[PDB]
Design a protein around this ligand. Structure first.
Ligand SMILES: O=P(O)(O)O[C@H]1[C@H](OP(=O)(O)O)[C@H](OP(=O)(O)O)[C@H](OP(=O)(O)O)[C@@H](OP(=O)(O)O)[C@H]1OP(=O)(O)O
Lengths: 41, 130, 69, 49, 56, 56
């Protein structure tokens, strides 16, 4: 219901705003993942 | 759920301080609107029936609790005995005969579905206005 | 053209002081001097709205509230 | 009961309406009471300090 | 010219990363479902002169 | 052009093997079409709905 210019009110497909790195790397078990944080001294 | 809970009326003098329009139920400032899933075919059929001859049945749920009547132009419903636009009628009256030319060979004589029909003091006032 | 010069003087002062409050939205002398200039006209229904939108940028000051009161 | 469909927007259209309006910021959320500590005033000399 | 096409072919063969795109689309099938785009079979020079006419 | 001239063929023009430059200037537009597509979309936005002076 009437947001800012970023939502719908503009066709400015601007540079530096692209779907780059559209996946998040998760910290697995060999690093300091929170499952090994919840029990170490 | 119980029918007696929703059937129980409100004790009061109807509160006539408001008018008839504002005291009426609503959700939008104009009428209580809610989506539904009515069939398309009979909807468009009775729409075309009212568009042609001007009679159709009356859709609601809780106006009178008994409703099976026709609306719009009343007498033309019983005049045609309740026919539809998709039904072949009992008679073929006031039918309108066109001419056809569907050989597709002649030049400037082919008039099929694009054919014109067989049938084919105000200027002074319009000058005085402009 | 007395009404023309009167409305011209009032419109120039209102336009200058509205540009002044448009430029600086922090210091509060401009709104109160503009609103007491309308209070000098002694018949207003718009200066209350001026004090009402002048306290939206600063409601923690004592001077604007006590002056409008 | 009426019928509600949607008109197809063709993908050969620039933005039709000039999004260039600028207004001053309106009245915010209304001010809560302020409720500080009781305000003190020091002296006539430390204010000179 | 020999060695510079060798250079460009090795630079193309070295950065040969797999196509990690997840979804696929066409952009012609999405135009065709719209009522404003229509499909017909024409001549080539008509299409070329048409797109340069429209570009002008 | 130096493989037409092998043998008794002639030094003059007639070099009509055109597919190789054709492929690379298709490779140009193949990667530049979304780029200046986005650029002309930004141009149509800047022309038709105006600019944003102090927005982003
Ligand atoms: O001057 P060169 O280094 O000897 O090369 C030229 C030159 O090609 P490049 O300059 O691109 O290398 C000519 O093209 P132009 O740039 O002069 O237009 C070309 O003729 P084409 O345009 O038909 O390709 C042909 O020269 P020629 O006119 O004699 O065919 C060619 O090689 P050669 O001069 O050795 O034949």
């Amino acid at each position: 219901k009437g947001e800012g210019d970023l939502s719908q009110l503009s066709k400015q497909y601007s540079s530096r705003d692209l779907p780059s790195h559209t996946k998040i790397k998760y910290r697995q078990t060999t690093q300091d993942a929170p499952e090994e944080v919840r029990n170490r001294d | 759920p119980t029918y007696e809970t929703m059937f129980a009326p409100e004790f009061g003098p109807e509160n006539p301080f408001r008018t008839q329009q504002m005291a009426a139920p609503r959700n939008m400032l104009s009428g209580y609107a809610e989506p539904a899933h009515i069939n398309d075919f009979m909807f468009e059929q009775q729409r075309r029936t009212f568009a042609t001859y001007g009679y159709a049945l009356d859709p609601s749920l809780d106006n009178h609790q008994v409703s099976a009547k026709y609306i719009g132009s009343v007498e033309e419903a019983e005049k045609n005995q309740g026919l539809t636009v998709f039904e072949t009628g009992q008679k073929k009256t006031e039918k309108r005969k066109k001419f056809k030319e569907n050989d597709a060979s002649n030049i400037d004589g082919f008039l099929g579905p694009w054919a014109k029909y067989v049938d084919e003091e105000e200027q002074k006032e319009l000058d005085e206005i402009t | 053209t007395d009404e023309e010069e009167l409305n011209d003087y009032k419109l120039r002062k209102r336009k200058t002081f509205e540009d002044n409050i448009r430029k600086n939205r922090t210091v509060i002398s401009n709104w109160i001097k503009y609103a007491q200039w309308e209070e000098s006209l002694k018949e207003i229904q718009r200066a209350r709205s001026i004090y009402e939108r002048a306290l939206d940028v600063d409601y923690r000051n004592i001077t604007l509230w006590l002056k409008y009161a | 009961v009426i019928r509600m469909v949607e008109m197809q927007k063709d993908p050969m259209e620039p933005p039709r309406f000039k999004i260039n309006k600028k207004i001053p910021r309106g009245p915010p959320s209304p001010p809560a009471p302020v409720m500080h500590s009781p305000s003190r005033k020091m002296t006539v000399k430390e204010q000179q300090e | 010219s020999y060695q510079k096409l060798l250079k460009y072919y090795v630079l193309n063969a070295l950065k040969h990363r797999p196509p990690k795109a997840q979804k696929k689309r066409y952009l012609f099938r999405s135009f065709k479902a719209t009522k404003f785009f229509q499909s017909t079979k024409l001549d080539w020079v008509e299409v070329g002169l048409q797109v340069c006419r429209q570009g002008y | 052009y130096y493989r037409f001239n092998t043998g008794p063929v002639g030094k003059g023009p007639g070099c009509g093997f055109w597919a190789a430059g054709w492929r690379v200037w298709l490779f140009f537009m193949r990667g530049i079409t979304p780029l200046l597509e986005r650029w002309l979309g930004n141009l149509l936005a800047r022309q038709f709905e105006g600019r944003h002076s102090k927005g982003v």
